[PDB]
Amino acid sequence: GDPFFVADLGDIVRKHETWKKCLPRVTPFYAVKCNDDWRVLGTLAALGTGFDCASNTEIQRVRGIGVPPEKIIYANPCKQISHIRYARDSGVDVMTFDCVDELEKVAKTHPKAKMVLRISTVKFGAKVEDCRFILEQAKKLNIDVTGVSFHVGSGSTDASTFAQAISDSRFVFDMGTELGFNMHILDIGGGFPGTRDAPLKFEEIAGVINNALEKHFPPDLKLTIVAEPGRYYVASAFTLAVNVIAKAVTQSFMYYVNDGVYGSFNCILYDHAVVRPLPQREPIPNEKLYPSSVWGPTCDGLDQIVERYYLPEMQVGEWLLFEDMGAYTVVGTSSFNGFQSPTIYYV
Amino acid sequence: RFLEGFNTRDALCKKISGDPFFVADLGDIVRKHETWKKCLPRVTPFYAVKCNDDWRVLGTLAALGTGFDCASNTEIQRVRGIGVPPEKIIYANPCKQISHIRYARDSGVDVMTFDCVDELEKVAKTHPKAKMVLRISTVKFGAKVEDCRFILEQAKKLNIDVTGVSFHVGSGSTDASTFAQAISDSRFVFDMGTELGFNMHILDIGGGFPGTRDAPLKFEEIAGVINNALEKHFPPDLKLTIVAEPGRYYVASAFTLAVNVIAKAVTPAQSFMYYVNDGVYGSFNCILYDHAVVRPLPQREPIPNEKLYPSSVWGPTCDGLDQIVERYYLPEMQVGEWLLFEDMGAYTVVGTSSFNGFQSPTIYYVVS
Ligand code: PXP
Numbered sequence: 153g154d155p156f157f158v159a160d161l162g163d164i165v166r167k168h169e170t171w172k173k174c175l176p177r178v179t180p181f182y183a184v185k186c187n188d189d190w191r192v193l194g195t196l197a198a199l200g201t202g203f204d205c206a207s208n209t210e211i212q213r214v215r216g217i218g219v220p221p222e223k224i225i226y227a228n229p230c231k232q233i234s235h236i237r238y239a240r241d242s243g244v245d246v247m248t249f250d251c252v253d254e255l256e257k258v259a260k261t262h263p264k265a266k267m268v269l270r271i272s273t274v275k276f277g278a279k280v281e282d283c284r285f286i287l288e289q290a291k292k293l294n295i296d297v298t299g300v301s302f303h304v305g306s307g308s309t310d311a312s313t314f315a316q317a318i319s320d321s322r323f324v325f326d327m328g329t330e331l332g333f334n335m336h337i338l339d340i341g342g343g344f345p346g347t348r349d350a351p352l353k354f355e356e357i358a359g360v361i362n363n364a365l366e367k368h369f370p371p372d373l374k375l376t377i378v379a380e381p382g383r384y385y386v387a388s389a390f391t392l393a394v395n396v397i398a399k400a401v402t403q404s405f406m407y408y409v410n411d412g413v414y415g416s417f418n419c420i421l422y423d424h425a426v427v428r429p430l431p432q433r434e435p436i437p438n439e440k441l442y443p444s445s446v447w448g449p450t451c452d453g454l455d456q457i458v459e460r461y462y463l464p465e466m467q468v469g470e471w472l473l474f475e476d477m478g479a480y481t482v483v484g485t486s487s488f489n490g491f492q493s494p495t496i497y498y499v
Numbered sequence: 500r501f502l503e504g505f506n507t508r509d510a511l512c513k514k515i516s517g518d519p520f521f522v523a524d525l526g527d528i529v530r531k532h533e534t535w536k537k538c539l540p541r542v543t544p545f546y547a548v549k550c551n552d553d554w555r556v557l558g559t560l561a562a563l564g565t566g567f568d569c570a571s572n573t574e575i576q577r578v579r580g581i582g583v584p585p586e587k588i589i590y591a592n593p594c595k596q597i598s599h600i601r602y603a604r605d606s607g608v609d610v611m612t613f614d615c616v617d618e619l620e621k622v623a624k625t626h627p628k629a630k631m632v633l634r635i636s637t638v639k640f641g642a643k644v645e646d647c648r649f650i651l652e653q654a655k656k657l658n659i660d661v662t663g664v665s666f667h668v669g670s671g672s673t674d675a676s677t678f679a680q681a682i683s684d685s686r687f688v689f690d691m692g693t694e695l696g697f698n699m700h701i702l703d704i705g706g707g708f709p710g711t712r713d714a715p716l717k718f719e720e721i722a723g724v725i726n727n728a729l730e731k732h733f734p735p736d737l738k739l740t741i742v743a744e745p746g747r748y749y750v751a752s753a754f755t756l757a758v759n760v761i762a763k764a765v766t767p768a769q770s771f772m773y774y775v776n777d778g779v780y781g782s783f784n785c786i787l788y789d790h791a792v793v794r795p796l797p798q799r800e801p802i803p804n805e806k807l808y809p810s811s812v813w814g815p816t817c818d819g820l821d822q823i824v825e826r827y828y829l830p831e832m833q834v835g836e837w838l839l840f841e842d843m844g845a846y847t848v849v850g851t852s853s854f855n856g857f858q859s860p861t862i863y864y865v866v867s
């Protein structure tokens with residue numbers, strides 16, 4: 153009675169149809185770090201997306217499935233020197249950076265790279281006020297700076313963050329052109345919601361992006377607008393089924409399932425994730441709900457998935473389901489306590 | 500995969516000539532065991548493999564004569580695979596998947612733990628001749644002492660062979676008095692078992708013993724309080740065996756992580772940001788899961804009167820949460836140089852993922 157994922161790949165197809173409708177000017181480069189499953193990456197490749205890779209291993213994974221290097225962006229601003237050499241031999245030329253020290257590595261290791269200055273919206277992002285000096289030094293290093301990127305992140309309450317980021321990008325775009333650079337790529341990053349229970353919808357985020365785009369980056373055959381969505385594509389696609397392996401009573405209950413914070417639910421710690429346990433059995437009308445906690449299978453007392461969510465009395469052998477579990481779930485798991493990661497089945 | 504050199508800090512400098520790597524002083528583990536036999540001579544250590552399940556670590560411990568606390572089928576197969584008999588294994592997971600109990604049974608492992616009646620209903624159907632150890636509370640695990648009578652009554656009805664009591668204080672103890680109260684409580688439950696007809700002969704005092712120098716509550720003080728409590732409540736007797744489940748005690752100071760500075764960024768107050776090729780998705784997952792605080796230490800020789808700047812250390816990953824140190828005073832470093840993190844053997848190599856396609860570091864071994 154092991155745990156398992158059900159990934160509906162048709163959900164990915166619908167997400168992309170909605171992307172083309174809402175953001176027709178923006179070519180999506182899927183952030184593979186989000187979910188690097190083969191059937192996910194094949195479905196996206198077939199739908200025609202690019203791919204945002206952050207390491208030599210992710211480049212190897214997408215190149216292995218026949219994706220050409222021009223559909224890959226190496227969007228890690230701080231790259232190990234060996235990793236840059238590897239990308240250069242795979243034909244991947246587009247890479248990000250956010251400081252001059254990164255350009256010193258690139259001038260030694262991959263001088264013909266098309267470099268995209270990532271700006272801040274504190275780990276990553278060159279402050280706008282440092283950007284002039286960065287680009288001046290790039291000219292001294294003979295770097296082909298070809299664009300600007302930013303990343304708003306998933307924690308956007310107000311869509312106005314996208315608008316200001318795009319306005320700031322235009323200011324850096326114009327600086328680049330003033331210094332003789334071939335500025336032709338805007339990369340608007342990720343952070344787009346992938347779930348139906350999101351407060352800031354995708355549809356209004358897109359409206360704010362498109363109005364800012366028409367203002368600051370009016371249509372032009374020279375300009376290519378690009379993005380780096382991760383969770384948007386895969387979040388609602390995966391559903392996790394977990395077996396209740398133990399039970400305890402105190403009214404309240406305590407359920408232990410065979411997957412937790414070391415496995416698929418590492419999203420709780422690493423990705424600010426909140427989840428909702430759903431009984432897989434048909435709900436009987438008017439059955440009472442008690443306040444209940446759910447726990448992973450490890451020793452650790454930190455291995456808790458839910459604190460007090462109102463569930464009906466369950467039994468050992470029954471299953472709980474977690475919807476919206478495809479983003480940053482099958483990628484951050486470990487083999488702690490010796491427990492195995494759930495097998496993925498596809499619809 | 501072994502390495503030249505007297506001590507740990509010598510062996511690091513030899514190999515450097517740029518993936519991250521561990522250097523594991525297996526002789527540190529030997530000195531931890533010697534200290535254990537001296538400070539807790541009545542207590543047989545069953546090492547908690549979940550802490551560091553490395554092959555060489557397990558083999559070193561088995562040869563020193565320790566048992567092994569296993570929490571799953573995978574960990575049991577791993578210790579049985581290196582020539583450890585089923586008697587030297589305790590299956591100290593109180594909430595076990597039915598299929599995992601079935602696996603322990605067929606492997607010879609009979610001692611398991613439990614903290615409630617539902618767990619016994621499982622054991623009756625699947626492993627009815629298991630020697631069961633009632634884990635008591637010191638909110639995740641542990642039967643409250645007030646529930647223990649009712650639990651052992653139900654255990655009589657299920658014909659369970661209850662043979663002992665266990666507890667777990669945990670590493671977050673500022674006062675050794677938790678151990679003395681747990682041992683008294685353990686005696687109370689021990690007497691209830693004997694009263695109800697059970698053959699109570701095992702006391703299991705859990706883990707939580709410090710494995711580092713910079714721990715405030717010292718090992719020697721903890722062991723002192725435990726032995727006073729044991730002499731009081733569990734006086735020496737040939738039928739009684741006392742057992743513990745140390746994890747971090749044995750391996751915490753045995754591992755040293757060597758990481759490479761793969762990037763830098765300056766801010767002219769003058770601060771530096773270092774990016775290294777290991778982070779919170781790899782070896783420093785201990786920061787999120789284990790409340791770990793780490794000190795970065797340049798491997799290069801410290802030149803006299805050299806300037807120190809406030810510095811952050813970040814992982815290689817592509818997440819704003821992947822930060823190893825927020826603010827620590829280090830000399831100006833350069834891309835290509837190395838940073839060392841001592842005391843990195845406990846809950847590091849076991850909680851790792853390959854997020855962003857970054858590989859976990861290789862382990863190399865020094866044998867003092
Ligand atoms: C990760 O934060 C990340 C992404 C993907 O973010 P979403 O999964 O919220 O869409 C995209 N680009 C960069 C640079 C990231 O770090």
Ligand code: PXP
Binds near residue numbers: 550
């Ligand atoms: C894990 O917390 C655990 C141990 C090992 O603890 P230490 O590494 O702090 O010594 C021992 N017993 C149990 C039941 C644990 O859950």
